[PDB]
DNA sequence: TCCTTCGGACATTCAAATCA
DNA sequence: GATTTGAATGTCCGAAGGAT
């Protein structure tokens, strides 16, 4: 029954953290961009459209 | 040793589907 | 209308190999 627990996620990951698959944080610039001395950039998330059927549930 | 890369486990998003 | 479902979507651990 290995379902490991994680610490709270960053609310949103900046572009560099998304690309690196590394942990972001909630301040801007994030810690990883502070360390790299690079610009910390937020990108838009995909928004689910309405009208897409799923089929019956259980 | 530090840094970069990344497969896939852990977690979130939210309209559809279902309930009441 | 209110609550539940669950695939799409998002986050980032931990391992491997490269860089310094
Ligand atoms: Zn970040
Ligand atoms: Zn950043």
Coordinates of N, CA, C and O and ligand atoms in Angstrom, one line a residue, chain A residues 13-18 24-25 27-34 38-42, ligand 2:
Chain A
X13 N 3.2 26.7 -10.6 CA 4.6 26.6 -10.9 C 4.9 27.6 -12.1 O 4.2 27.6 -13.0
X14 N 6.0 28.3 -11.9 CA 6.5 29.2 -13.0 C 7.0 28.3 -14.1 O 7.2 27.1 -14.1
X15 N 7.4 29.0 -15.2 CA 7.7 28.3 -16.5 C 9.0 27.5 -16.3 O 9.1 26.4 -16.8
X16 N 10.0 28.0 -15.6 CA 11.3 27.3 -15.4 C 11.0 26.0 -14.6 O 11.5 25.0 -14.9
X17 N 10.2 26.2 -13.5 CA 9.9 25.0 -12.7 C 9.1 24.0 -13.4 O 9.3 22.8 -13.2
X18 N 8.2 24.4 -14.3 CA 7.4 23.5 -15.2 C 8.4 22.7 -16.1 O 8.3 21.5 -16.2
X24 N 8.3 24.6 -7.3 CA 8.2 26.0 -7.3 C 7.8 26.4 -5.9 O 7.7 25.6 -4.9
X25 N 7.4 27.7 -5.7 CA 6.9 28.2 -4.4 C 6.0 29.4 -4.7 O 5.8 29.8 -5.9
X27 N 6.1 32.7 -3.8 CA 6.6 34.0 -4.0 C 7.2 34.2 -5.4 O 7.5 33.2 -6.1
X28 N 7.3 35.4 -5.8 CA 7.8 35.7 -7.2 C 8.8 36.8 -7.1 O 8.5 37.9 -6.7
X29 N 10.1 36.6 -7.6 CA 10.5 35.3 -8.2 C 10.6 34.1 -7.2 O 10.7 34.3 -6.0
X30 N 10.4 32.9 -7.8 CA 10.5 31.7 -7.0 C 12.0 31.4 -6.6 O 12.9 32.0 -7.2
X31 N 12.2 30.5 -5.7 CA 13.5 30.3 -5.1 C 14.4 29.8 -6.2 O 15.6 30.1 -6.3
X32 N 13.9 28.9 -7.1 CA 14.8 28.3 -8.2 C 15.2 29.4 -9.1 O 16.4 29.4 -9.6
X33 N 14.4 30.3 -9.5 CA 14.7 31.4 -10.3 C 15.7 32.4 -9.6 O 16.5 33.0 -10.3
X34 N 15.5 32.6 -8.3 CA 16.5 33.4 -7.6 C 17.9 32.8 -7.6 O 18.9 33.4 -7.9
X38 N 17.5 34.0 -13.0 CA 16.7 34.1 -14.3 C 15.3 34.7 -14.0 O 14.9 34.7 -12.8
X39 N 14.7 35.3 -15.0 CA 13.4 35.8 -14.9 C 12.4 34.7 -14.6 O 12.4 33.7 -15.2
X40 N 11.5 35.0 -13.6 CA 10.5 34.0 -13.2 C 9.1 34.4 -13.8 O 8.6 35.5 -13.6
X41 N 8.6 33.5 -14.7 CA 7.5 33.8 -15.5 C 6.4 32.8 -15.3 O 6.6 31.6 -15.3
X42 N 5.1 33.4 -15.1 CA 3.9 32.5 -15.0 C 3.2 32.4 -16.3 O 3.1 33.4 -17.1
Ligands
LIG2 ZN1 10.5 31.0 -11.1

